[PDB]
């Protein structure tokens, strides 16, 4: 349910995770892709 995880861009409405790293959670692919501008330089380590 949309309680266990919280979109780093929105809130508990989170439902979808980043493929690549499982350290952060989003709500939709839109937030995933929009965060990509910062996330692309971070995504890869994953700790
Ligand atoms: Zn990632
Ligand atoms: Zn979101």
UniProtKB/Swiss-Prot annotation:
What is the annotated tissue distribution of the protein whose record heads this document? Answer: Expressed in various tissues and cells such as in peripheral mononuclear cells and hormone-secreting pituitary cells. Expression in pancreatic lymph nodes of patients with type 1 diabetes is 20 times higher than in healthy controls. Highly expressed in fetal and adult brain.
Q: Indicate the secretion signal residues.
A: none
Q: What is the effect of changing residue 29 to N?
A: In a primary colorectal cancer
Binding residue positions for Zn(2+) 1: 7, 10, 27, 31
What does the annotation give as the result of altering residue 41 to S?
No effect on folding of MYND-type zinc finger
Question: Out of the domains of life, which is the source?
Answer: Eukaryota
Question: In UniProt terms, what is the effect of altering residue 45 to H?
Answer: In a primary colorectal cancer
Q: What else is known?
A: Defective DEAF1 could confer a growth advantage to the mutated cells influencing the development and progression of neoplasia, e.g. in the case of colorectal carcinomas. Subcellular location in colorectal carcinomas (cytoplasmic or nuclear) is a prognostic factor that identifies a subgroup of patients with reduced survival. In addition, changes in the subcellular location correlates with the proliferative status of the cells.
Subunit text? Homodimer. Isoform 1 and isoform 4 may form a heterodimer. Interacts with LMO2 and CLIM2. Interacts with LMO4; LMO4 blocks export from nucleus. May interact with the corepressors NCOR1 and NCRO2. Identified in a complex with the XRCC5 and XRCC6 heterodimer. Interacts (via the SAND domain) with the DNA-PK complex subunit XRCC6; the interaction is direct and may be inhibited by DNA-binding.
Q: What is this protein called?
A: Deformed epidermal autoregulatory factor 1 homolog
Which organism is the protein's source?
A: Homo sapiens
What stretch of the parent protein is included here?
Answer: 501 to 544 of 565
């Amino acid at each position: 349910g949309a309680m266990e995880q919280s979109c780093v861009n929105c809130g508990r409405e989170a439902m979808s995770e980043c493929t690549g790293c499982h350290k952060v959670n989003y709500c939709s692919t839109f937030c995933q892709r929009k965060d990509w501008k910062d996330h692309q330089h971070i995504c890869g380590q994953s700790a």
